Amino acid sequence: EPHSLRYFYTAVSDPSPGVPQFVTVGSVDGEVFVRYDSETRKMEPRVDWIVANVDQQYWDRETETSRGNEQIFRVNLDTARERYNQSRGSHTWQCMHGCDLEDGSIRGFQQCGYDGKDFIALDKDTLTYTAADAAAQITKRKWEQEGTVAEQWKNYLENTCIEWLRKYVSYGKDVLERRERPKVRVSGMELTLSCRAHGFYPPPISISWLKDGVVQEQETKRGSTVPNSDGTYHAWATIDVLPGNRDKYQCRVEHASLPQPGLFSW
Amino acid sequence: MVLIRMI
Amino acid sequence: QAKAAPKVQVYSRHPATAGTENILNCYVEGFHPPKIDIALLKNGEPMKDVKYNDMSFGDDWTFQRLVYAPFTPTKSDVYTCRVDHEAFTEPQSFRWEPDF
């Protein structure tokens, strides 16, 4: 059901391995589909469905715009450093924007952060920017005084962003709307029982531990759901139990790919 | 598709 | 807050069968700043053909990255993900539990 389009922009004053001076990543339903950085200087596909569906003009325009954004982000690091009276050093500037389509309604956001703390965010309902502190109030004033900044962002988030998200979902439908069943294995140590689900899609899942059919919530440990390299996901749940109550315990897995919850034993 | 302003 | 420490999970694409080709994953999230070294080690030695996906980040600005490599687990070999980040004082190792 729900879909999202998001762009993540990261600029750093001190690059390091794995961390270019500037990177932009676009994601649809949480999966990266395009990436640009200051070293390749090209917007590049990271999934097949995007290449097979847009023209070379898409790549050229995205590459030109990203080359322009690189410069802006370089300037914004400088401005932020001076607003906070900071010496040269290691700093980060990040911005994220995007839209969600759910049921009939639309959500959109645009927000930036400096050294990992909020700086400024759009309030799309009031067409104002919310400033985290005095430094960010100067930016609030600049963007609100310009007279068109919040309105252009409102337009992009509610219109342009949603229009592209619909096109993306349509291009990727076979990937994005597929269902892949979890492959589940139960293990145990010294007794710690572990129910691990491998390779499911989409990411929502519910793994519960039952003692003779009884949902043991308060005693269930759970990881964060995490991706595999092929765009499928992984999740686990453990239970700390007394050695040799073993027969009693079953793992239940609820997932869209499974018409009925799966039940698994050690 | 990826508005980006100076702060 | 200056910094946020990585939280790390290490896991395989498929349930582990000794002698069967698989993929080892190390997913690292919740960290800031983005500088980080994430290494997949077989018996403490860097594995071949490791790949590092593009980072994402959350509402709270913290970064996430998937690092992975093909591998064929055996009963005896030891697989770890070792992460060095400035919000740790010393690099931290996370052992994959084979669960064969």
mmCIF file of C-alpha atoms in Angstrom:
data_model
loop_
_atom_site.group_PDB
_atom_site.id
_atom_site.type_symbol
_atom_site.label_atom_id
_atom_site.label_comp_id
_atom_site.label_asym_id
_atom_site.label_seq_id
_atom_site.Cartn_x
_atom_site.Cartn_y
_atom_site.Cartn_z
ATOM 1 C CA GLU A 1 0.000 0.000 0.000
ATOM 2 C CA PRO A 2 2.040 3.144 1.054
ATOM 3 C CA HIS A 3 4.777 4.698 -1.220
ATOM 4 C CA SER A 4 7.406 7.373 -0.669
ATOM 5 C CA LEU A 5 9.939 9.314 -2.698
ATOM 6 C CA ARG A 6 12.853 10.778 -0.696
ATOM 7 C CA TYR A 7 16.129 12.556 -1.464
ATOM 8 C CA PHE A 8 18.978 12.574 1.022
ATOM 9 C CA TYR A 9 21.763 15.148 0.604
ATOM 10 C CA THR A 10 24.967 15.030 2.633
ATOM 11 C CA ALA A 11 27.853 17.530 2.427
ATOM 12 C CA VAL A 12 30.902 17.261 4.680
ATOM 13 C CA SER A 13 33.801 19.726 5.184
ATOM 14 C CA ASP A 14 36.208 16.777 5.775
ATOM 15 C CA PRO A 15 35.581 13.848 3.453
ATOM 16 C CA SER A 16 36.834 10.388 4.361
ATOM 17 C CA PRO A 17 36.653 6.846 2.777
ATOM 18 C CA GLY A 18 33.052 6.059 1.926
ATOM 19 C CA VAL A 19 32.066 9.718 2.523
ATOM 20 C CA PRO A 20 32.445 12.041 -0.459
ATOM 21 C CA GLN A 21 32.402 15.835 -0.115
ATOM 22 C CA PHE A 22 28.821 15.757 -1.387
ATOM 23 C CA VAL A 23 26.367 12.920 -2.095
ATOM 24 C CA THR A 24 22.724 12.855 -3.115
ATOM 25 C CA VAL A 25 20.703 9.602 -2.924
ATOM 26 C CA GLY A 26 17.117 9.235 -4.171
ATOM 27 C CA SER A 27 15.000 6.451 -2.715
ATOM 28 C CA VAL A 28 11.539 5.082 -3.589
ATOM 29 C CA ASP A 29 9.783 3.018 -0.907
ATOM 30 C CA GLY A 30 13.031 3.046 1.103
ATOM 31 C CA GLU A 31 15.231 1.602 -1.664
ATOM 32 C CA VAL A 32 17.864 3.672 -3.355
ATOM 33 C CA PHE A 33 17.167 4.181 -7.122
ATOM 34 C CA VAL A 34 19.609 7.016 -8.106
ATOM 35 C CA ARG A 35 22.841 8.414 -6.622
ATOM 36 C CA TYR A 36 25.148 11.369 -7.400
ATOM 37 C CA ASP A 37 28.411 12.311 -5.749
ATOM 38 C CA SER A 38 31.148 14.971 -6.092
ATOM 39 C CA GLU A 39 33.687 12.377 -7.312
ATOM 40 C CA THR A 40 31.699 10.720 -10.166
ATOM 41 C CA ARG A 41 29.910 14.055 -10.859
ATOM 42 C CA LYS A 42 27.087 12.025 -12.577
ATOM 43 C CA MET A 43 23.598 11.083 -11.499
ATOM 44 C CA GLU A 44 23.614 7.278 -11.846
ATOM 45 C CA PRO A 45 21.011 4.581 -11.647
ATOM 46 C CA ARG A 46 21.190 2.000 -8.777
ATOM 47 C CA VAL A 47 18.233 -0.171 -9.947
ATOM 48 C CA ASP A 48 17.297 -1.413 -13.413
ATOM 49 C CA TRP A 49 13.721 -0.104 -13.583
ATOM 50 C CA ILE A 50 14.746 3.548 -13.587
ATOM 51 C CA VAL A 51 17.142 3.180 -16.625
ATOM 52 C CA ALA A 52 14.641 1.203 -18.637
ATOM 53 C CA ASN A 53 12.026 3.883 -18.162
ATOM 54 C CA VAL A 54 13.546 7.389 -18.413
ATOM 55 C CA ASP A 55 15.431 8.963 -21.360
ATOM 56 C CA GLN A 56 19.025 10.226 -21.542
ATOM 57 C CA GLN A 57 17.641 13.796 -20.952
ATOM 58 C CA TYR A 58 16.600 12.637 -17.435
ATOM 59 C CA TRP A 59 20.199 11.685 -16.567
ATOM 60 C CA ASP A 60 21.624 14.873 -18.159
ATOM 61 C CA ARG A 61 19.167 17.174 -16.340
ATOM 62 C CA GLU A 62 19.624 15.376 -12.997
ATOM 63 C CA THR A 63 23.426 15.460 -13.458
ATOM 64 C CA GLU A 64 23.355 19.228 -14.272
ATOM 65 C CA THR A 65 21.080 20.018 -11.327
ATOM 66 C CA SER A 66 23.188 17.898 -8.957
ATOM 67 C CA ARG A 67 26.396 19.633 -10.145
ATOM 68 C CA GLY A 68 24.605 22.942 -9.277
ATOM 69 C CA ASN A 69 23.459 21.598 -5.876
ATOM 70 C CA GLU A 70 27.053 20.521 -5.021
ATOM 71 C CA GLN A 71 28.092 24.193 -5.176
ATOM 72 C CA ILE A 72 25.168 25.342 -3.058
ATOM 73 C CA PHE A 73 25.878 22.776 -0.421
ATOM 74 C CA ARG A 74 29.653 23.795 -0.381
ATOM 75 C CA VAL A 75 28.503 27.439 0.238
ATOM 76 C CA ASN A 76 26.012 26.368 2.890
ATOM 77 C CA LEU A 77 28.760 24.544 4.883
ATOM 78 C CA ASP A 78 30.721 27.858 4.763
ATOM 79 C CA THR A 79 27.721 29.926 5.840
ATOM 80 C CA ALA A 80 26.835 27.583 8.686
ATOM 81 C CA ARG A 81 30.431 27.598 9.976
ATOM 82 C CA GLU A 82 30.408 31.417 10.033
ATOM 83 C CA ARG A 83 26.893 31.655 11.625
ATOM 84 C CA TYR A 84 28.099 29.482 14.465
ATOM 85 C CA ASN A 85 31.461 31.350 14.716
ATOM 86 C CA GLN A 86 33.291 28.037 14.275
ATOM 87 C CA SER A 87 36.866 27.416 13.291
ATOM 88 C CA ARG A 88 37.704 25.298 10.200
ATOM 89 C CA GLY A 89 37.101 21.641 11.014
ATOM 90 C CA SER A 90 34.978 18.627 10.539
ATOM 91 C CA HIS A 91 31.265 19.458 9.989
ATOM 92 C CA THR A 92 28.216 18.004 8.224
ATOM 93 C CA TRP A 93 25.305 19.673 6.445
ATOM 94 C CA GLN A 94 22.296 17.475 5.497
ATOM 95 C CA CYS A 95 19.005 18.093 3.843
ATOM 96 C CA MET A 96 16.149 15.610 3.143
ATOM 97 C CA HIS A 97 12.927 16.145 1.297
ATOM 98 C CA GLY A 98 10.216 13.989 -0.131
ATOM 99 C CA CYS A 99 6.545 13.044 -0.335
ATOM 100 C CA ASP A 100 4.436 10.100 0.806
ATOM 101 C CA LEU A 101 1.289 8.881 -0.984
ATOM 102 C CA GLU A 102 -1.072 7.009 1.352
ATOM 103 C CA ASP A 103 -4.739 6.139 0.804
ATOM 104 C CA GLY A 104 -5.932 9.401 -0.759
ATOM 105 C CA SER A 105 -3.732 11.762 1.124
ATOM 106 C CA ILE A 106 -0.315 13.288 0.453
ATOM 107 C CA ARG A 107 2.479 14.212 2.974
ATOM 108 C CA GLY A 108 5.574 16.261 2.099
ATOM 109 C CA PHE A 109 8.580 17.495 4.034
ATOM 110 C CA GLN A 110 11.779 19.484 3.469
ATOM 111 C CA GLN A 111 14.259 19.835 6.328
ATOM 112 C CA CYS A 112 17.959 20.589 6.854
ATOM 113 C CA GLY A 113 20.363 19.908 9.679
ATOM 114 C CA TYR A 114 23.801 21.034 10.684
ATOM 115 C CA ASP A 115 26.224 18.699 12.520
ATOM 116 C CA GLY A 116 23.410 16.242 12.966
ATOM 117 C CA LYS A 117 21.022 18.703 14.701
ATOM 118 C CA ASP A 118 17.933 20.384 13.269
ATOM 119 C CA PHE A 119 18.575 23.686 11.533
ATOM 120 C CA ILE A 120 15.520 24.567 9.468
ATOM 121 C CA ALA A 121 12.353 22.820 8.280
ATOM 122 C CA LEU A 122 9.408 23.724 6.077
ATOM 123 C CA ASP A 123 5.987 24.022 7.763
ATOM 124 C CA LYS A 124 4.000 23.448 4.552
ATOM 125 C CA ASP A 125 0.665 24.216 6.311
ATOM 126 C CA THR A 126 1.669 27.757 7.279
ATOM 127 C CA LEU A 127 4.105 28.365 4.382
ATOM 128 C CA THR A 128 6.795 29.345 6.906
ATOM 129 C CA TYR A 129 10.150 27.857 7.916
ATOM 130 C CA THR A 130 10.742 26.693 11.458
ATOM 131 C CA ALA A 131 14.161 27.717 12.726
ATOM 132 C CA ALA A 132 15.936 25.730 15.357
ATOM 133 C CA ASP A 133 17.979 28.704 16.785
ATOM 134 C CA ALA A 134 19.189 32.272 16.122
ATOM 135 C CA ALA A 135 21.539 31.182 13.347
ATOM 136 C CA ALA A 136 18.674 29.454 11.522
ATOM 137 C CA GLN A 137 16.340 32.468 12.033
ATOM 138 C CA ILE A 138 18.513 34.462 9.621
ATOM 139 C CA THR A 139 17.787 31.725 6.978
ATOM 140 C CA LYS A 140 14.027 31.748 7.999
ATOM 141 C CA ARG A 141 13.997 35.484 7.299
ATOM 142 C CA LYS A 142 15.869 35.181 4.025
ATOM 143 C CA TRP A 143 13.625 32.397 2.619
ATOM 144 C CA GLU A 144 10.293 33.953 3.906
ATOM 145 C CA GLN A 145 11.276 37.405 2.639
ATOM 146 C CA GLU A 146 12.081 36.026 -0.815
ATOM 147 C CA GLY A 147 8.344 35.498 -1.042
ATOM 148 C CA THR A 148 8.291 32.374 -3.220
ATOM 149 C CA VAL A 149 10.455 29.819 -1.438
ATOM 150 C CA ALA A 150 7.830 28.092 0.710
ATOM 151 C CA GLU A 151 5.280 28.335 -2.163
ATOM 152 C CA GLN A 152 7.707 26.685 -4.618
ATOM 153 C CA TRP A 153 8.386 23.911 -2.067
ATOM 154 C CA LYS A 154 4.695 23.450 -1.422
ATOM 155 C CA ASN A 155 4.133 23.157 -5.234
ATOM 156 C CA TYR A 156 6.993 20.663 -5.652
ATOM 157 C CA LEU A 157 5.961 18.492 -2.635
ATOM 158 C CA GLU A 158 2.234 18.266 -3.392
ATOM 159 C CA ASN A 159 2.479 18.210 -7.176
ATOM 160 C CA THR A 160 5.835 17.541 -8.868
ATOM 161 C CA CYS A 161 7.126 15.100 -6.183
ATOM 162 C CA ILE A 162 3.850 13.126 -6.129
ATOM 163 C CA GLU A 163 3.680 13.053 -9.991
ATOM 164 C CA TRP A 164 7.199 11.601 -10.168
ATOM 165 C CA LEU A 165 6.500 9.158 -7.280
ATOM 166 C CA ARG A 166 3.472 7.809 -9.246
ATOM 167 C CA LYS A 167 5.696 7.432 -12.378
ATOM 168 C CA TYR A 168 8.425 5.671 -10.293
ATOM 169 C CA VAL A 169 5.958 3.262 -8.632
ATOM 170 C CA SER A 170 4.643 2.463 -12.133
ATOM 171 C CA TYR A 171 8.170 1.916 -13.528
ATOM 172 C CA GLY A 172 9.185 -0.249 -10.556
ATOM 173 C CA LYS A 173 5.829 -1.929 -9.931
ATOM 174 C CA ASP A 174 7.185 -5.486 -10.476
ATOM 175 C CA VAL A 175 9.899 -4.900 -7.906
ATOM 176 C CA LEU A 176 8.095 -2.525 -5.544
ATOM 177 C CA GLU A 177 4.788 -4.340 -5.329
ATOM 178 C CA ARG A 178 6.188 -7.893 -5.243
ATOM 179 C CA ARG A 179 5.934 -10.250 -2.243
ATOM 180 C CA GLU A 180 8.736 -12.537 -1.187
ATOM 181 C CA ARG A 181 8.257 -15.055 1.565
ATOM 182 C CA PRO A 182 10.537 -15.124 4.612
ATOM 183 C CA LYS A 183 12.763 -18.215 4.869
ATOM 184 C CA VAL A 184 12.663 -18.923 8.581
ATOM 185 C CA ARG A 185 14.963 -20.845 10.871
ATOM 186 C CA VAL A 186 14.734 -21.311 14.565
ATOM 187 C CA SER A 187 17.986 -21.822 16.571
ATOM 188 C CA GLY A 188 18.956 -22.158 20.248
ATOM 189 C CA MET A 189 21.939 -21.673 22.615
ATOM 190 C CA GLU A 190 23.034 -22.816 26.125
ATOM 191 C CA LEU A 191 18.218 -21.967 26.248
ATOM 192 C CA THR A 192 18.062 -18.887 24.055
ATOM 193 C CA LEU A 193 15.687 -19.439 21.156
ATOM 194 C CA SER A 194 16.158 -17.385 18.072
ATOM 195 C CA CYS A 195 13.650 -17.020 15.232
ATOM 196 C CA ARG A 196 15.346 -15.473 12.170
ATOM 197 C CA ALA A 197 13.420 -14.504 9.024
ATOM 198 C CA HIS A 198 15.492 -14.213 5.804
ATOM 199 C CA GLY A 199 14.711 -12.614 2.506
ATOM 200 C CA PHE A 200 11.144 -11.222 2.841
ATOM 201 C CA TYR A 201 9.590 -8.282 0.941
ATOM 202 C CA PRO A 202 7.917 -5.893 1.708
ATOM 203 C CA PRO A 203 9.620 -4.938 5.006
ATOM 204 C CA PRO A 204 6.654 -4.917 7.468
ATOM 205 C CA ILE A 205 6.778 -8.134 9.457
ATOM 206 C CA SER A 206 5.734 -9.458 12.854
ATOM 207 C CA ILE A 207 7.738 -12.181 14.559
ATOM 208 C CA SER A 208 6.308 -13.386 17.877
ATOM 209 C CA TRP A 209 7.279 -16.132 20.293
ATOM 210 C CA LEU A 210 4.524 -18.406 21.636
ATOM 211 C CA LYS A 211 4.588 -20.709 24.683
ATOM 212 C CA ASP A 212 1.879 -23.367 24.021
ATOM 213 C CA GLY A 213 0.028 -20.905 21.727
ATOM 214 C CA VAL A 214 0.511 -17.978 24.177
ATOM 215 C CA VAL A 215 1.958 -14.659 22.783
ATOM 216 C CA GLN A 216 4.948 -13.871 25.058
ATOM 217 C CA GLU A 217 5.351 -10.057 24.440
ATOM 218 C CA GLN A 218 7.155 -8.870 27.510
ATOM 219 C CA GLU A 219 9.848 -11.600 27.167
ATOM 220 C CA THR A 220 10.501 -11.202 23.405
ATOM 221 C CA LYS A 221 13.667 -9.462 22.203
ATOM 222 C CA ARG A 222 13.587 -8.020 18.607
ATOM 223 C CA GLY A 223 16.025 -6.467 16.205
ATOM 224 C CA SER A 224 15.517 -3.633 13.855
ATOM 225 C CA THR A 225 14.358 -4.911 10.353
ATOM 226 C CA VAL A 226 17.376 -4.598 8.045
ATOM 227 C CA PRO A 227 17.908 -5.014 4.235
ATOM 228 C CA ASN A 228 19.813 -7.650 2.395
ATOM 229 C CA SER A 229 21.822 -6.781 -0.707
ATOM 230 C CA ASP A 230 19.045 -7.847 -3.101
ATOM 231 C CA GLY A 231 16.469 -5.454 -1.623
ATOM 232 C CA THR A 232 14.824 -8.135 0.502
ATOM 233 C CA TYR A 233 14.849 -7.853 4.327
ATOM 234 C CA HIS A 234 15.864 -9.672 7.515
ATOM 235 C CA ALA A 235 14.490 -9.710 11.061
ATOM 236 C CA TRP A 236 14.776 -11.814 14.233
ATOM 237 C CA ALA A 237 13.203 -12.306 17.572
ATOM 238 C CA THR A 238 14.859 -14.063 20.558
ATOM 239 C CA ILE A 239 13.400 -15.523 23.758
ATOM 240 C CA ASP A 240 15.277 -16.290 27.015
ATOM 241 C CA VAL A 241 13.738 -19.486 28.399
ATOM 242 C CA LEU A 242 14.577 -22.262 30.874
ATOM 243 C CA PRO A 243 16.562 -25.196 29.348
ATOM 244 C CA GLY A 244 14.210 -27.996 28.178
ATOM 245 C CA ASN A 245 10.874 -26.133 28.057
ATOM 246 C CA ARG A 246 11.766 -26.555 24.409
ATOM 247 C CA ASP A 247 8.718 -28.357 23.037
ATOM 248 C CA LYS A 248 6.468 -25.525 24.295
ATOM 249 C CA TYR A 249 7.910 -22.703 22.218
ATOM 250 C CA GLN A 250 6.860 -21.849 18.649
ATOM 251 C CA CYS A 251 7.840 -18.880 16.498
ATOM 252 C CA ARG A 252 4.916 -17.140 14.653
ATOM 253 C CA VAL A 253 5.685 -15.003 11.554
ATOM 254 C CA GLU A 254 3.105 -12.643 10.057
ATOM 255 C CA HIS A 255 3.907 -11.273 6.624
ATOM 256 C CA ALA A 256 1.969 -10.111 3.471
ATOM 257 C CA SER A 257 3.484 -12.952 1.442
ATOM 258 C CA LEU A 258 2.001 -15.587 3.843
ATOM 259 C CA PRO A 259 -1.840 -15.997 3.614
ATOM 260 C CA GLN A 260 -1.680 -17.492 7.173
ATOM 261 C CA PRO A 261 1.026 -16.754 9.828
ATOM 262 C CA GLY A 262 3.911 -19.259 9.649
ATOM 263 C CA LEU A 263 4.653 -21.455 12.707
ATOM 264 C CA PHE A 264 8.152 -22.698 13.327
ATOM 265 C CA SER A 265 9.839 -24.962 15.933
ATOM 266 C CA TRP A 266 13.488 -25.558 16.884
ATOM 267 C CA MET B 1 13.108 14.115 -9.774
ATOM 268 C CA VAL B 2 15.355 16.244 -7.418
ATOM 269 C CA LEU B 3 14.424 24.607 -4.792
ATOM 270 C CA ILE B 4 17.921 23.910 -3.444
ATOM 271 C CA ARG B 5 18.812 27.351 -1.969
ATOM 272 C CA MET B 6 21.610 29.108 -0.143
ATOM 273 C CA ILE B 7 20.962 29.369 3.562
ATOM 274 C CA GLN C 1 25.037 16.279 21.174
ATOM 275 C CA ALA C 2 28.268 15.949 19.245
ATOM 276 C CA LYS C 3 28.089 12.278 18.182
ATOM 277 C CA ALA C 4 25.961 9.120 18.046
ATOM 278 C CA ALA C 5 27.410 5.562 18.292
ATOM 279 C CA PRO C 6 26.710 2.904 15.549
ATOM 280 C CA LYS C 7 24.306 0.066 16.288
ATOM 281 C CA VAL C 8 25.341 -3.026 14.354
ATOM 282 C CA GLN C 9 23.695 -6.287 13.226
ATOM 283 C CA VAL C 10 25.551 -9.078 11.412
ATOM 284 C CA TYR C 11 23.501 -11.709 9.582
ATOM 285 C CA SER C 12 23.472 -13.843 6.405
ATOM 286 C CA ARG C 13 21.205 -13.557 3.348
ATOM 287 C CA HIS C 14 20.068 -17.169 3.774
ATOM 288 C CA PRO C 15 19.929 -19.557 6.711
ATOM 289 C CA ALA C 16 23.543 -20.870 7.041
ATOM 290 C CA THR C 17 24.465 -24.293 5.614
ATOM 291 C CA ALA C 18 28.169 -25.194 6.076
ATOM 292 C CA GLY C 19 29.817 -25.475 2.597
ATOM 293 C CA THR C 20 26.963 -23.601 0.817
ATOM 294 C CA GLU C 21 27.535 -20.190 -0.810
ATOM 295 C CA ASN C 22 25.801 -17.371 1.020
ATOM 296 C CA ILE C 23 26.169 -13.586 1.580
ATOM 297 C CA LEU C 24 27.365 -12.029 4.847
ATOM 298 C CA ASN C 25 25.825 -8.676 5.829
ATOM 299 C CA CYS C 26 26.728 -6.066 8.347
ATOM 300 C CA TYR C 27 24.153 -3.340 8.759
ATOM 301 C CA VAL C 28 25.286 -0.305 10.721
ATOM 302 C CA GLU C 29 22.904 2.515 11.702
ATOM 303 C CA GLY C 30 22.234 5.334 14.140
ATOM 304 C CA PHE C 31 25.752 6.868 13.769
ATOM 305 C CA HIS C 32 26.899 10.454 13.312
ATOM 306 C CA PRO C 33 29.277 11.830 12.035
ATOM 307 C CA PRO C 34 29.256 9.827 8.753
ATOM 308 C CA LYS C 35 32.987 8.954 8.826
ATOM 309 C CA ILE C 36 33.179 5.270 9.737
ATOM 310 C CA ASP C 37 35.188 2.162 8.923
ATOM 311 C CA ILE C 38 33.162 -1.025 8.647
ATOM 312 C CA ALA C 39 35.162 -4.198 7.864
ATOM 313 C CA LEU C 40 33.967 -7.770 7.258
ATOM 314 C CA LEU C 41 36.658 -10.140 8.594
ATOM 315 C CA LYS C 42 37.078 -13.897 8.198
ATOM 316 C CA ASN C 43 39.233 -15.099 11.092
ATOM 317 C CA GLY C 44 40.209 -11.494 11.681
ATOM 318 C CA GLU C 45 41.342 -10.946 8.046
ATOM 319 C CA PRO C 46 39.580 -8.706 5.481
ATOM 320 C CA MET C 47 37.189 -10.701 3.233
ATOM 321 C CA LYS C 48 37.256 -10.540 -0.571
ATOM 322 C CA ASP C 49 34.801 -8.586 -2.764
ATOM 323 C CA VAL C 50 33.171 -6.588 0.054
ATOM 324 C CA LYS C 51 30.612 -4.044 -1.229
ATOM 325 C CA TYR C 52 29.271 -0.932 0.597
ATOM 326 C CA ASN C 53 25.877 0.455 -0.255
ATOM 327 C CA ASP C 54 24.924 4.137 -0.414
ATOM 328 C CA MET C 55 24.040 5.650 2.980
ATOM 329 C CA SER C 56 20.602 6.817 4.001
ATOM 330 C CA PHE C 57 19.711 8.775 7.014
ATOM 331 C CA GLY C 58 16.842 9.155 9.466
ATOM 332 C CA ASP C 59 14.729 12.042 10.820
ATOM 333 C CA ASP C 60 17.296 12.311 13.595
ATOM 334 C CA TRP C 61 20.085 12.782 10.931
ATOM 335 C CA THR C 62 21.903 9.584 11.839
ATOM 336 C CA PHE C 63 23.344 7.484 9.029
ATOM 337 C CA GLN C 64 22.866 3.876 7.970
ATOM 338 C CA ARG C 65 24.918 1.666 5.694
ATOM 339 C CA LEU C 66 24.792 -1.935 4.510
ATOM 340 C CA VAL C 67 28.104 -3.676 3.938
ATOM 341 C CA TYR C 68 28.109 -7.189 2.454
ATOM 342 C CA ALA C 69 30.207 -9.881 0.844
ATOM 343 C CA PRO C 70 29.699 -13.297 -0.683
ATOM 344 C CA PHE C 71 30.984 -16.114 1.565
ATOM 345 C CA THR C 72 30.716 -19.855 2.064
ATOM 346 C CA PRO C 73 30.487 -20.385 5.773
ATOM 347 C CA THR C 74 32.193 -23.447 7.301
ATOM 348 C CA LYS C 75 31.753 -24.820 10.807
ATOM 349 C CA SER C 76 35.124 -23.615 11.922
ATOM 350 C CA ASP C 77 35.745 -20.192 10.258
ATOM 351 C CA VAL C 78 34.919 -17.089 12.419
ATOM 352 C CA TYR C 79 33.079 -14.100 10.795
ATOM 353 C CA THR C 80 32.981 -10.643 12.338
ATOM 354 C CA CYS C 81 32.026 -7.164 11.451
ATOM 355 C CA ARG C 82 34.502 -4.676 13.015
ATOM 356 C CA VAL C 83 33.411 -1.061 13.158
ATOM 357 C CA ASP C 84 35.597 1.896 13.980
ATOM 358 C CA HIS C 85 33.707 5.168 14.634
ATOM 359 C CA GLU C 86 34.601 8.262 16.680
ATOM 360 C CA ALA C 87 31.615 7.625 19.061
ATOM 361 C CA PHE C 88 33.381 4.337 20.151
ATOM 362 C CA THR C 89 36.734 4.541 21.992
ATOM 363 C CA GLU C 90 38.182 1.474 20.254
ATOM 364 C CA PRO C 91 36.907 -0.435 17.250
ATOM 365 C CA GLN C 92 34.040 -2.844 18.215
ATOM 366 C CA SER C 93 33.598 -6.390 16.821
ATOM 367 C CA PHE C 94 30.289 -8.052 16.256
ATOM 368 C CA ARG C 95 30.432 -11.822 15.648
ATOM 369 C CA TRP C 96 28.055 -13.496 13.273
ATOM 370 C CA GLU C 97 26.355 -16.425 15.107
ATOM 371 C CA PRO C 98 26.166 -19.157 12.501
ATOM 372 C CA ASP C 99 22.935 -20.849 13.661
ATOM 373 C CA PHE C 100 23.567 -23.891 11.363
#
